Amino acid sequence: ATSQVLHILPKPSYEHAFNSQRTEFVTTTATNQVELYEQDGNGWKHARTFSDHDKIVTCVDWAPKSNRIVTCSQDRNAYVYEKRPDGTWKQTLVLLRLNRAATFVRWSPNEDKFAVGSGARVISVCYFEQENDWWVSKHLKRPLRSTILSLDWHPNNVLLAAGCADRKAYVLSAYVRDVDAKPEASVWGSRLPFNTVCAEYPSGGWVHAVGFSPSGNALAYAGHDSSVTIAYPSAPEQPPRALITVKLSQLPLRSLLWANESAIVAAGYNYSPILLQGNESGWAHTRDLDAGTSKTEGPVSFTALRSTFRNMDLKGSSQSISSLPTVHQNMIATLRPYAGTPGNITAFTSSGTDGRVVLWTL
């Protein structure tokens, strides 16, 4: 797998999103700001900040077809950003009605609603009313017992998966009338009203990541125990066909993405994207996409003269501290499609706590 480092951000990057044309990306720095980056030849340039949040921004997402950015923060708010004709962005506060921080945000596949995970034991499913010119929030709350660490939407607009700090992965209906048309019958159910519970799958550690299969017929999720579990449902009120856990030898995956119906890429505290492959008969960790998993006299500049004396003075010796062998130098926080049709992701991007934004080609 080829990798290219697109940019190095000055501060940590728990989330990023590209637009549909991959011509700009938005990223959450560790502050209350969000950074918008545009192309600059083969490089990238900081086009503008957003700074409407009061406390640390936790997550950000960019809607492909409708070209809107949604942002979430420890200030308990969300803002939706929409493009004006003159090229500036219109902010819009969304009243999430959360008692604690917003922790994670995702746009729905039809982009008519988004969901915000929280530390408040609830998920704010947010949709727009043209009759009021308001974004309004519905709380999913019945089975959720702790911080929601991650969200994913089923390819049908109704079902929401959630990874939770109570060591469970939930599948919940986020069906909203006068936004959704009725969902088709599925392996998760057919009688599917708001906050109906399709699964409460267990984990060995906090569920950092969740992801539906490209067909929607299975859920992968990743735990803080350094495992990926893949769940194949049977029917409502019935146990799964298979509930396959693969246990990794590395530090935990924080993020997770189906490459196709039979393969998953995952990454996290191991600093490296891994590939898992399988089906309802069994799953295995099959490759590491970073070759760095294998642990792989002339004139001298003023900045080398000065830094070797600063290293002798501040540290033990002149010798510079070496890079980690992986491309990411710190945990890789998010893992997102970049190229190929849905069901056949050909390339994906990652961003990390080291501020690298990196493109990976399978």
Partner 1 sequence: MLSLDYNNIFIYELLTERFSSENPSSIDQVVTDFDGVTFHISTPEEKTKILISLSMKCYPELVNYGTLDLLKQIYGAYVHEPEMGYNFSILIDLQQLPATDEEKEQLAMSISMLKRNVLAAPFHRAFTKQAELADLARKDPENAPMLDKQATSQELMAIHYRDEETIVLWPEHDRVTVVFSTKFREETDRIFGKVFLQEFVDARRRPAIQTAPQVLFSYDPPLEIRDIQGIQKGDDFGFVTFVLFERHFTPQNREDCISHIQVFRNTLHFHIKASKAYMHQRMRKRVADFQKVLNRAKPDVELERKTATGRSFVRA
**Nearer to partner 1 (CB atom), residue 182 or residue 315:** 315
**Nearer to partner 1 (CB atom), residue 21 or residue 321:** 321
How far is residue 174's CA from residue 324's CA, in Å, rounded to a whole number? 42
- Per rule CB under 8 A, is residue 247 in the interface with partner 1? no
**# chain residues binding partner 1, by CB under 8 A:** 5
The distance of closest approach from Cβ of residue 273 to partner 1 in the complex, given in angstroms and rounded to an integer, is 23
**Nearer to partner 1 (CB atom), residue 237 or residue 313:** 313
**Order of all β-strands in the sheet with 123-129:** 102-107, 113-118, 123-129, 134-140
Q: Which stretch binds partner 1 (CB under 8 A): 70-78, 105-113, 313-321, 334-342?
A: 313-321
Among 65, 141, 145, 315, binds partner 1 (CB under 8 A): 315
Rg of the chain, C-alpha, whole Å: 21
- Find tokens 């501020």 and name the residue: 355
How far is residue 219's CA from residue 214's CA, in Å, rounded to a whole number? 10
The distance of closest approach from Cβ of residue 321 to partner 1 in the complex, given in angstroms and rounded to an integer, is 6
The distance of closest approach from Cβ of residue 199 to partner 1 in the complex, given in angstroms and rounded to an integer, is 42
How far is residue 158's CA from residue 145's CA, in Å, rounded to a whole number? 22
The mark string for 319-348 relative to partner 1 (x by CB under 8 A, - otherwise) is: --x---------------------------
The pair of structure tokens assigned to 335 is: 């893992």
The distance of closest approach from Cβ of residue 91 to partner 1 in the complex, given in angstroms and rounded to an integer, is 30
**Nearer to partner 1 (CB atom), residue 300 or residue 314:** 314
Phi/psi zone of residue 361: left (φ > 0), alpha (ψ -120 to 50 degrees), beta?
beta
**Nearer to partner 1 (CB atom), residue 92 or residue 311:** 311
Rounded-to-10 torsion of CA 105, 107, 112, 117: -30
The mark string for 279-308 relative to partner 1 (x by CB under 8 A, - otherwise) is: ----------------------------x-
Measure Cα distances from 154 to 105, 246, 357 in Å: 15, 22, 26
CB of 89 closer than 8 Å to CB of 132 = no
The distance of closest approach from Cβ of residue 301 to partner 1 in the complex, given in angstroms and rounded to an integer, is 15
Phi, psi of 97 (to 5 degrees): 60, 35
C-beta contacts of 183-188 below 8 A and 24+ residues apart: 183/156, 183/157, 183/158, 183/159, 184/156, 186/156, 186/159, 186/216, 186/217, 187/217, 187/233, 187/234, 187/235, 188/154, 188/159, 188/216, 188/233, 188/236
Q: Which of residues 135-154 bind partner 1 (CB under 8 A)?
A: none
Q: Which stretch binds partner 1 (CB under 8 A): 12-20, 75-83, 249-257, 309-317?
A: 309-317
Phi, psi of 161 (to 5 degrees): -85, 145
The distance of closest approach from Cβ of residue 353 to partner 1 in the complex, given in angstroms and rounded to an integer, is 12
Q: Which stretch binds partner 1 (CB under 8 A): 43-51, 54-62, 137-145, 314-322?
A: 314-322
Among 41, 85, 299, 316, binds partner 1 (CB under 8 A): 316
Measure Cα distances from 39 to 21, 47, 62, 340 in Å: 11, 9, 17, 20
Among 132, 294, 314, 322, binds partner 1 (CB under 8 A): 314
The distance of closest approach from Cβ of residue 26 to partner 1 in the complex, given in angstroms and rounded to an integer, is 24
**Nearer to partner 1 (CB atom), residue 238 or residue 317:** 317
Residues in contact with partner 1 by the rule CB under 8 A: 307, 314-316, 321
